[PDB]
């Protein structure tokens, strides 16, 4: 629930918030609005949680980072220890208990394929549980919208 100027503003700032010294003045000139009103409107939409975040979103691969999907057959007696060693890694962003023999599925991001492998080997060493390192070699569909 907002006005057409907020819809036009959000249509611009989603593609690109202006990379200029006075960006709200640049938005004001494009929208036919006073510089301060555009700041007021952005603050309001942020406060109402319509704007989640205003900043940079990176493309991991272009920063020299590699990503993988990891899987393990975790027995009930090793569960709490394994889950804790996995979650203690900052490179792990997603961890899930899944309905299969391979019941622990997690994402691991790091600067290289060698560092990711050393992290996985380090986990196996502490828990006694082997891990499948499954990087993607081909991408057909990706969600960001």
């Amino acid at each position: 629930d907002m006005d057409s100027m907020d819809r036009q503003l959000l249509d611009i700032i989603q593609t690109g918030f202006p990379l200029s010294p006075r960006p709200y003045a640049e938005l004001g000139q494009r929208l036919g609005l006073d510089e301060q009103e555009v700041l007021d409107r952005v603050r309001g939409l942020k406060a109402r949680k319509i704007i989640r975040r205003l900043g940079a979103n990176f493309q991991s691969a272009k920063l020299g980072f590699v990503s993988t999907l990891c899987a393990a057959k975790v027995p009930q007696d090793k569960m709490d220890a394994f889950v804790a060693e996995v979650n203690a890694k900052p490179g792990v962003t997603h961890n899930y208990l899944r309905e299969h023999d391979y019941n622990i599925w997690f994402t691991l991001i790091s600067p290289s394929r060698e560092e990711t492998q050393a992290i996985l080997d380090g986990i196996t060493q502490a828990t006694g549980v082997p891990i499948l390192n499954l990087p993607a070699t081909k991408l057909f569909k990706i969600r960001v919208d």
Binding site: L10, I13, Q14, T15, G16, F17, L19, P21, R22, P23, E35, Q36, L39, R43, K49, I50, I51, R52, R53, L54, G55, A56, N57, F58, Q59, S60, K62, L63, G64, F65, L69, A71, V83, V86, N87, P90, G91, V92, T93, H94, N95, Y96, L97, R98, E99, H100, Y102, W105, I109, L132, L134, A136, T137, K138, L139, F140, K141, I142, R143, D145
Partner: protein, 159 residues
Amino acid sequence: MSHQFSPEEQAVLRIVQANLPDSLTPYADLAEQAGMTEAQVLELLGRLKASGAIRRFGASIKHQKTGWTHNAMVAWKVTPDQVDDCGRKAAEHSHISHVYYRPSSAPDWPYEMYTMIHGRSEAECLGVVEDVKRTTSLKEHAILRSLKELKKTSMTYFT
């Protein structure tokens, strides 16, 4: 990160990965916190936006036109000759958001084509599984139903 960026550049990037300073001149505020000029801030952000290192420089909004809910992680058996064909065909579906090919040398894990399925009711997700079976050569599969979300975090590239 030290190999691609100067300490000052990394300082700008540590802030922008969170939020832009809340003012009329955010690039001047970035410049003073990092030990750079405003023009240098703009050149760094412009360079990474141009190269694609910054996929998006702006606002993250609540969804777009998305409601809820049901997710379905399904892994399929695939031979090398089927890969591109099955990949491209499975990805043409509206209810699928992720299609990955992840080779596996593990004897007890023969599934390598991954489709992330969406929609509503459990049966609608099972329906897209039937849609993939009629529209592709993919047959044998494993449904990896989420039982518990153990960690959901965002990656911090600049520490």
